[PDB]
Design a protein around this nucleic acid. Structure first.
Ligand SMILES: [Zn+2]
Lengths: 128, 134, 175
RNA sequence: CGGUGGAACACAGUGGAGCCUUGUCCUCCGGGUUAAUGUCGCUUUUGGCAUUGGCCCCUGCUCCUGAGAGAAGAAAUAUACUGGGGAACCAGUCUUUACCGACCGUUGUUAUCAGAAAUUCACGGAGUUCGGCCUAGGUCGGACUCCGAUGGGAACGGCAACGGUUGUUCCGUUUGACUUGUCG
């Protein structure tokens, strides 16, 4: 089919950008969890901001993320869904996950099982 | 009510940083009404007598370990700062700092055109274009 | 001509540790009692499945039960099968997450056997949530849950910086 | 950087030639009222549908031009939408006594992977309505609505080029004063 070339020289600028993205995601998640465990929604427009800036960096470097991150974050307001509104299933569709802002992220789960994403398949992925 | 605030994250952030300043001014007024200079007694005074006013107050004692340890460990990982310091490379480190974000940094105003801005340390909650928020 | 290029993609650095399913051992002593009880429920009458033992086997009822509607029953136990094909992954990446924010003492048990496709093909979906309030079953459920089947969280309990994880995916390019 | 002193208030500043779809006193779409006709249900009569005819619907201001600045209470809290600014606000798309609204059409682009799909191709599932076989309501076809894990994406959304405006295009000046030369 073609040529099989596997390079492990990772580039320094891509490592800098992904460390920046991962640091923003970690600080937003830790703000959200440290606020959520203790008391009510104090600075929930704050951490979301980081995620939004994170996604804007994903516009600049043109990089892609795993569907775990994009499944965690929202699409319109770009907030973390670690505490969502409601989860409904088999309500004449497949699945529905409601949020506080009203934007839902649903999944076709009632069609068939054993469907995996392209990054979750057996051999398509090499860690580190 | 809650849906109309978080329609735009920027405007909700502006409303939050305005509400923190208004709550700080109300805290100064209730602190002069308290006539107690101790802040640890002041926080318990607000918890006893003003429940709704206490809800939007920041917690700096919580803010220091949740930010400083992550920031220092991220810089120790990113700039390759290890126990071996004699293999350092300064130009690529300054290029990485030009590529790294300052969201969550402890930073100090050491020199300024205004004589009152100097001496201020603070941790970033958001980076603006031409101002700075600590 | 096709050429394969490896593209660097940022991973969720803690999803492996957030999906560290709990340590379960000496598990064939448990499926005997569990399967015998579930079959003895499922034999007689579909109303008599749920009159002596109150169990919910629909995920919408699991969310509505853990939302905060019923707060009396504090010890509530859950059984979820992993390492099993024909099981949806979207629910499975959100079942141990939604039980963490529940204020009730919810005890998740991960069943490790791959051959256990019976409970999914028979009852509803392959998961079981029930209450140990005054039932006889708790008289052994409290016995073994302290032994091997402990469920605790190390990942959010202490303060710790997490190292970054950048993986790389395959991409074909035709020219 | 742009325009004026050439156009005399659009008298497209004027003239001539060529071509055609031969310059249609036309048509904005759209919304409201009134009159007439035909069908369908209540039965002095009214209601709904379709056609035809008539009326009504907004120069924000100055200026020849270029341009300049004012305000978005006829649905909002941020004063139409979108993005940023530290806030007065800025940029782009727009409208302005709108007591109804109006983001014009065509072409191409969004590389590679992914996904069913990169432009209302198509495909899969659910619901409704109609027709045929048929009558414990089973199947088939057509139409509509909703959803489908991915990717900045599925949004008639973003970018670039072209005007149907009162037919298009070309050619010429309306710009001079002295000195000299010719002609009457
Ligand atoms: Zn959301």
């Amino acid at each position: 089919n073609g040529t099989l070339l596997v390079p492990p020289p990772r580039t320094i600028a891509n490592q800098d950008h992904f460390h920046r993205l991962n640091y923003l995601y970690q600080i937003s998640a830790y703000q959200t969890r440290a606020r959520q465990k203790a008391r009510t929604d104090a600075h929930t427009p704050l951490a979301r901001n980081y995620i939004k800036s994170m996604d804007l960096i994903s516009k600049k470097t043109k990089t892609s993320l795993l569907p775990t991150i994009k499944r965690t974050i929202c699409k319109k307001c770009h907030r973390l869904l670690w505490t969502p509104k409601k989860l409904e299933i088999t309500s004449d569709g497949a699945l529905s996950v409601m949020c506080g802002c009203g934007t839902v992220k649903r999944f076709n789960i009632g069609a068939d099982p054993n469907y995996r994403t392209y990054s979750e398949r057996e051999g398509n992925l090499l860690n580190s | 009510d809650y849906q109309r605030i978080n329609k735009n994250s920027k405007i909700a952030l502006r409303e939050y940083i305005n509400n923190c300043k208004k709550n700080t001014k109300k805290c100064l007024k209730l602190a002069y009404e308290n006539k107690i200079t101790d802040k640890e007694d002041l926080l318990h005074y607000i918890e006893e007598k003003h429940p709704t006013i206490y809800e939007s107050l920041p917690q700096y004692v919580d803010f220091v370990p949740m930010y400083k340890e992550l920031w220092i460990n991220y810089i120790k990982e990113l700039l390759n700062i290890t126990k071996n310091l004699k293999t350092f490379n300064g130009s690529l480190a300054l290029l990485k700092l030009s590529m790294a974000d300052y969201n969550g940094a402890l930073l100090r105003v050491t020199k300024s055109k205004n004589k009152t801005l100097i001496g201020l340390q603070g941790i970033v909650i958001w980076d603006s274009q031409k101002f700075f928020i600590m | 001509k096709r050429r394969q290029v490896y593209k660097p993609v940022l991973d969720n650095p803690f999803t492996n540790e957030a999906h560290m399913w709990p340590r379960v051992h000496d598990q064939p002593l448990i499926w005997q009692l569990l399967q015998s009880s579930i079959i003895n429920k499922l034999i007689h009458i579909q109303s008599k499945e749920n009159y002596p033992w109150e169990l919910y086997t629909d995920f919408n009822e699991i969310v509505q039960y853990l939302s905060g509607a019923h707060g009396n029953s504090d010890p509530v136990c859950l059984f979820v099968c992993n390492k099993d094909p024909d099981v949806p992954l979207v629910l499975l990446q959100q079942i141990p997450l939604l039980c963490y924010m529940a204020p009730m003492t919810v005890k998740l048990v991960q069943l490790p056997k791959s051959a256990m496709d019976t409970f999914k093909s028979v009852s509803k979906y392959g998961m079981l949530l029930l209450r140990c309030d005054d039932r006889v079953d708790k008289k052994f459920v409290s016995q073994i849950q302290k032994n091997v089947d402990l469920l605790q969280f190390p990942w959010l309990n202490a303060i710790k910086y997490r190292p970054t994880s950048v993986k790389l995916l395959k991409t074909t390019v035709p020219i």
